[PDB]
From Swiss-Prot:
Catalyzes the NADP-dependent formation of prostaglandin F2-alpha from prostaglandin H2. Also has aldo/ketoreductase activity toward the synthetic substrates 9,10-phenanthrenequinone and p-nitrobenzaldehyde. Keywords: Cytoplasm, Fatty acid biosynthesis, Fatty acid metabolism, Lipid biosynthesis, Lipid metabolism, NADP, Nucleotide-binding, Oxidoreductase, Prostaglandin biosynthesis, Prostaglandin metabolism. It is found in: Cytoplasm. This is 9,11-endoperoxide prostaglandin H2 reductase. Monomer. It comes from the Eukaryota. Substrate binds at H110. The keyword Cytoplasm applies. It comes from Leishmania major. Belongs to the aldo/keto reductase family. The record marks K77 as: Lowers pKa of active site Tyr. GO terms for molecular function: aldo-keto reductase (NADPH) activity; nucleotide binding.
Amino acid sequence: GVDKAMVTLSNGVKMPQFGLGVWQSPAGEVTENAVKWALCAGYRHIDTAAIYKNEESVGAGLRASGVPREDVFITTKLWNTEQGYESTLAAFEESRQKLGVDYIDLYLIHWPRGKDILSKEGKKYLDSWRAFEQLYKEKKVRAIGVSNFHIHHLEDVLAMCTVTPMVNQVELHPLNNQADLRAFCDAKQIKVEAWSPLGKLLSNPILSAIGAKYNKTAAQVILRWNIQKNLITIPKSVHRERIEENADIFDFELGAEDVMSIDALNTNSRYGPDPDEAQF
Ligand SMILES: [Cl-]
C-alpha cells in the first residue's frame, strides 16, 4: 500500500516509493492542506524544496496531520544560488528551521546549473556535494542525492565523492522515459525519482484505454508504470480527491503488453528545462 511500498537506498535507508510533490503548491493553507490530506490518506513521503517557498507550510501540515514525524520521509533541496560549501551548510540549516524538524531525511542538489554558468562560475555542485557529505557524517540528514543531473554530471560527482549520491530526481514520464540515465543509475546504485510524472498527456488514447481495462485513470496508469519500473514517484496535487486518487494504484497491475505500449510512447520530449541548457 501507499504507506508500505519502499525502495532501499544504497545506505540502507527505506524511502517510500510514493510521495506527495509540493512543487508549485502555494505557501499557506493550500500547501498545509495538501500535506495534511496526503498524510491522512496514507502517504508517508513529502517532497519540497527551498525554492518552492513552502517549507514552513509542509512542516505545519505534518504537525496538523498528527502522524509522528519519525514515520514520515521529508525531502528538500538546495537551491542553485546557494551552491558552494559554507553556503550549502547555511541553506540546509534554513530549510531545517523552516520545516521545524531536527533532521531531514533526504537533501538534494536541485540542479547542476546550466553549461554557461558552469563555464563561468565553475562546477559549484561539487563543493555543495562535499558539504552534503559533511551534513551526512554529522547525522543531520539521513540520505543525500541530486536532482536534474545527466550522466556526465554524475560522472563528475562519482570521480570525487566519498558518499555516492543515493537518489537522482529527474523529469521522467512516458514521453521522456530516461532509459539511458536509468541504466547508468542502476549500475551505480543511484535510485531514480520521477518529477512531473504525469507530464495533454493525460488525454493520451493509449493511456486511457489501458486505464479502462482496470477501471483506472490515465494518471493512475502512469503512476503504476512508475512503480513497476522501480522508480520513486512524487505526483503533485493540491486537491484532496486527486491526492487520494493518485495513491490508489496498489490494487492493480499492468501486464507486459501494457508496459510495452507505454514504453513505446517515448519521444525524449521535455516539458521542463534541459539541465545542460538552463540559464539558471
Ligand atoms: Cl500482456
